[PDB]
Design a binder for these strands. Structure first.
Lengths: 489, 539
DNA sequence: TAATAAACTAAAAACTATTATTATG
DNA sequence: TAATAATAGTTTTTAGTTTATTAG
């Protein structure tokens, strides 16, 4: 369903992060700032529908709607805009840190209960459907000790209250993420890992909803309603927009075919459609064109059953289409969808069917292959139970195959290249490869939105790794070209 | 760049009459040849046609063989096809009352082909059989016909009222036509013609026998016309040192329409006064015309727009480097999913000819991966402009030379991640055992694969892949109706269309009772969204 | 040397978000 | 006369376009 996963970062300012443990490593402060930059970046080009906010405590001036001390907001919850990154990023670096020490301040006291309360109030201000609320904490301390334990008590109360409210808490290690000197007080508040939040995943995007609700038709009489899902599809560069030269404003577009005979534009009635074959000018209306295209009503005209044992596996027309039963016209549909899938042992017999995605479109044939549920050991479901539509080829599809059967290789070579290939094996993580192009586009767009020239050219294994795998195997393949004359020359 | 077809037809009396239900095989012949020829002409094929009528009066044939090639009349000789011949075929051809020798028609058509060999590029050629094998013929012509076919080298195609192998609907998906109820005259005719054609080709000729019904369903009538696609030579080198040069071939393709639809004036029925344009006005509180050349192509980034001119992208885009078929790595054949295949075309891999070292190399590779059940990963690069893909390549076995199936594979940003409720364990929709048994009854009662003899005897009761896409034939039929009848409305759906698409009726008849048990066992409801014609001609 | 892959255009549907009807007073 | 009840507004695939760019 709809909803937004708004999130807010909370950063400590107690001067502990202002120092990098007197070493080469980045300050905790600046590492956190870089993390925030990374999250904005990964947010803008993933879903410009969330909300984000950043507030610093342990401060000198105090900015907030509630005039509380030691609390310094910077951005109330908003859609992540490039302006946010512009303003934030000038605070990073050693120079940004030292000039931030003065433009705002440098460390102070605070009271954790107050900052928690302020963040809660900040969430309350929003006027949207908030799907997931999260406050993730950036701090270097362990806990307040040189305070009254009443402060700690108030903190515990407020934390429990927020947990009641439905507010989800996270905490990040700053001094030595991985050093494991935290959590002698936070053991009962929250319910490192920030490197993950850093530049590890980017250029993503998400969708939620379903495809057309299409009628499954098994007989002329009885009915059954299902749902269609397309669990994969090519991502394209998002469509451009036509600005001005200089107003940077989208320009309108009135658009018709015109006629020189008169100043009045053409008319949809006046427009006619035709095809030319020399002596033939077949004159048609768009309407009769659609009538030509249409054959029957949208739905799944069931053809019959075919055992999975073999249909083919080398043919492909379109990406597969997941099916999930759903009450669309008829209740208890999942009642008939409860079976056909529990045991595919004899249900593997697939379902040849006639498919019609929408109005008037000439149907194809679809292989309604059942795919039973799998469970991941983390109680995670991927490839949910149901069906995948494999589009079925037609006779006109199988274009000409030139016939060339001449020579089979000698068996002394087949085992030898078996030894060759066996050395290299990649598990094929389906997430291990990426479209370089859209990602490059994204990084470019990030560049122009800010003062970055074009400092992004990283490869993501799209290029061959054999630049090192060549020596990985060594050179056994070279003498393993026992073709005496090299095919190359 | 050229093909030659010659249509010889029987116009006797047996063509006129037929068993009821098994409609006149001559009308089957005319319909099949009609959509054949209109496909030829619509596809602007660099084709060639000769039309001959035998069994009719006179001898339009150049040679009557000492008045022995009698009743053999060429109708429309070797010239570029037009609607004249097809309209004559569908309409102006009428049933006759006498016959001649079909073999003589064959040889004179071959002679016409021989006559039309000069001045025109000569590439290929075909002959097809249209005779119900009840005419009168000799038996000593086997030598001359076998020598002509073994020297003049014209591919043959057979057709029959029945097949080599009420309920008999039209010859589409229905019960097999009898192969033993024919007249004996047709028996010796079929025997001798099948002997001569197997002598032409060989064993695969035994499968080359077809019928009007087969041409209706299958595409053998259309496979004798063909167009090869261009090679795509590439270096499939594997590694960093050795090199393999091979070629690429588009194998499977979403074959769409190639001919567009111009937008036409209703009055002049022309295009000149129809100029399509836009002005690119500007959105402000006031309308303001702005030149098309006053614009920049920005993008929606964050909550604003970053102007990104072409001169920008052209020099920040992904500078790929040439076509390539490099290999990334390897994984198990299980480490792929039919749900995971991606792209728009299966591309088949073949070793480049004239380089047999590559041939043996890939033969060994495909054999090895077949042995290891191991699939490969390739970065598929097309050119200097197409962005690269990542795709699986795995062996495809066959009785002939094998091949390597290559398919594009998705990317990490291409996967769509949804969650679905697990209905394998439904506390609200757990299927009843009566429902389960009804399900089993439906599964077993109806099926579209005939398994028998336990000899891997897989025959599809509804073989789909041999069907073409009906949209094209429907388009063509409407084209004929419109161009021949300037003031007539659109024709009906050409029931043959459905007949091709209807499933075998015996299946639904046998499984109707299981269907009745389903309709009894399960609860169903209805809802809105029914669409209808609003205003109707009541009369 | 034209195929053709890609950028480019409408077009239909879902998931929304809402408004006409009664209802009962 | 407070209770519902059809409905149009965003995205989004699709899919026919048009367009370069190796090619004979």
């Amino acid at each position: 369903y709809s909803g937004r996963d708004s999130l807010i970062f909370l950063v400590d300012a107690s001067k502990a992060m202002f120092e990098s443990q007197s070493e080469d490593e980045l300050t905790p402060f600046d590492m956190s700032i870089q993390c925030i930059q990374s999250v904005y970046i990964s947010k803008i080009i993933s879903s410009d529908r969330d909300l984000l906010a950043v507030v610093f405590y342990g401060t000198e001036k105090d900015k907030n709607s509630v005039n509380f001390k030691n609390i310094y907001v910077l951005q109330e919850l908003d859609n992540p805009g490039a302006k946010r990154i512009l303003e934030l990023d000038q605070f990073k670096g050693q120079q940004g840190q030292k000039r931030f020490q003065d433009m705002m301040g440098h460390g102070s006291d605070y009271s954790l209960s107050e900052v928690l309360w302020v963040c809660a109030n900040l969430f309350s201000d929003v006027q949207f459907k908030m799907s997931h609320k999260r406050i993730m904490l950036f701090t270097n301390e362990d806990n307040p000790h040189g305070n009254d334990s009443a402060k700690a008590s108030r903190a515990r109360t407020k934390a429990g209250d927020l947990r009641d409210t439905g507010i989800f808490l996270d905490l990040m290690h700053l001094k030595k993420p991985g050093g494991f000197d935290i959590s002698l007080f936070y053991r009962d508040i929250i319910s490192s890992k920030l490197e993950d939040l850093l530049r590890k995943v980017r250029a993503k995007e998400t969708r939620k909803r379903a495809l057309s609700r299409l009628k499954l038709k098994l007989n002329k009489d009885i009915v059954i309603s299902v749902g269609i899902y397309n669990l994969v599809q090519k991502a394209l560069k998002p469509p451009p927009i036509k600005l001005y030269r200089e107003t940077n404003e989208p320009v309108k577009t009135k658009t018709r075919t015109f006629n020189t005979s008169t100043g009045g534009l053409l008319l949809p009635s006046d427009t006619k459609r035709s095809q030319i074959y020399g002596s033939r000018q077949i004159i048609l209306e768009k309407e009769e064109t659609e009538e030509l295209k249409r054959f029957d009503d949208p739905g799944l005209m069931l053809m019959g059953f075919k055992p999975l044992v073999l249909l083919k596996k080398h043919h492909y027309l379109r990406p597969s289409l997941f099916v999930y039963p759903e009450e669309s016209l008829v209740i208890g549909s999942s009642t008939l969808f409860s079976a056909l899938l529990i045991k595919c042992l004899e249900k593997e017999v697939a379902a040849l069917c006639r498919y019609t995605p929408r109005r008037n479109i000439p149907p194809y044939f679809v292989a309604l292959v059942p795919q039973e549920e799998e469970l991941d050991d983390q109680k995670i479901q991927v490839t949910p139970p149901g069906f995948q539509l494999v589009f079925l080829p037609f006779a006109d599809d199988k274009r000409k195959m030139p016939f060339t059967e001449k020579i089979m290789a000698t068996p002394e070579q087949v085992g030898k290249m078996k030894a060759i290939v066996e050395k290299l094996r990649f598990t094929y993580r389906s997430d291990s490869f990426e479209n370089p192009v859209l990602q490059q586009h994204f990084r470019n767009l990030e560049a122009l939105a800010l003062d970055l020239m074009e400092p992004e050219q990283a490869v993501d294994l799209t290029l061959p790794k054999v630049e090192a795998m060549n020596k990985r195997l060594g050179s056994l393949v070279d003498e393993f070209k026992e073709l005496v004359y090299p095919p190359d020359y | 760049n050229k093909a030659a077809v010659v249509l010889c037809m029987d116009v006797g009396f047996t063509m006129s009459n037929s068993i009821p239900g098994i409609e006149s095989p001559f009308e089957q012949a005319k319909k099949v040849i009609t959509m054949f020829v209109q496909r030829q002409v619509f596809a602007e094929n660099k084709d060639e046609i000769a039309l001959v009528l035998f069994g009719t009066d006179g001898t339009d044939n150049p040679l009557s063989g000492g008045d022995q090639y009698q009743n053999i009349t060429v109708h429309r000789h070797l010239m570029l096809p037009d609607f004249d011949l097809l309209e004559d075929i569908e309409s102006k051809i009428q049933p006759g009352s006498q016959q001649a020798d079909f073999l003589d028609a064959l040889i004179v058509s071959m002679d016409v082909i021989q006559h039309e060999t000069i001045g025109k590029k000569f590439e290929k050629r075909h002959i097809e059989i249209f005779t119900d094998l009840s005419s009168r013929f000799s038996k000593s012509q086997l030598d001359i016909i076998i020598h002509s076919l073994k020297k003049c080298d014209i591919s043959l195609q057979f057709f029959l009222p029945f097949s080599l192998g009420g309920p008999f609907r039209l010859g589409g998906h229905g019960p097999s036509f009898p192969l033993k109820g024919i007249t004996e005259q047709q028996k010796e005719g079929l025997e001798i013609v099948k002997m001569v054609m197997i002598s032409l080709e060989g064993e695969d000729g035994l499968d080359e026998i077809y019928s009007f019904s087969e041409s209706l369903r299958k595409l053998c009538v259309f496979k004798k016309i063909e167009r090869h696609s261009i090679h795509w030579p590439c270096r499939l080198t594997i590694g960093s040192n050795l090199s393999i040069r091979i070629a690429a071939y588009k194998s499977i393709l979403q074959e769409r329409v190639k001919k567009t639809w111009t937008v036409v004036d209703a009055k002049t029925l022309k295009k000149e006064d129809i100029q399509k344009e836009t002005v690119y006005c500007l959105n402000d509180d006031d309308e303001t015309e702005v030149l098309k050349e006053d614009i920049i192509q920005g993008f929606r980034y964050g909550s604003d727009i970053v102007p990104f001119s072409k001169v920008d992208e052209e020099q920040m885009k992904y500078k790929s480097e040439g076509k390539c078929f490099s290999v990334l790595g390897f994984c198990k054949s299980s480490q792929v999913q039919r749900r995971f295949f991606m792209g728009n075309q299966v591309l088949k891999v073949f070793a480049a000819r004239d380089d047999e070292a590559a041939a043996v190399a890939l033969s060994s590779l495909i054999h090895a991966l077949d042995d290891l059940d191991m699939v490969a990963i390739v970065r598929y690069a097309y050119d200097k402009r197409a962005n690269p893909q990542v795709g699986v390549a795995f062996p495809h076995i066959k009785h002939n030379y094998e091949c390597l199936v290559y398919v594009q594979l998705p990317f990490m940003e291409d996967l769509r991640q949804y969650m679905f409720s697990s209905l394998k364990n439904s506390k609200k929709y757990a299927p009843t055992e009566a429902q389960l048994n009804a399900v089993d009854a439906l599964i077993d009662s109806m099926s579209l694969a005939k398994k028998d003899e336990k000899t891997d005897t897989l025959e599809d009761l509804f073989p789909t892949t041999k069907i073409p896409n009906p949209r094209f034939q429907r388009l063509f039929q409407c084209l004929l109706h419109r161009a021949l009848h300037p003031r007539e409305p659109l024709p009906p759906i050409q029931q043959h269309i459905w007949n091709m698409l209807n499933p075998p009726a015996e299946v639904t008849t046998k499984s109707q009772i299981p269907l009745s048990k389903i309709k009894t066992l399960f609860p169903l409801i209805e809802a809105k969204k029914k669409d209808q014609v609003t205003a109707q001609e009541i009369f």
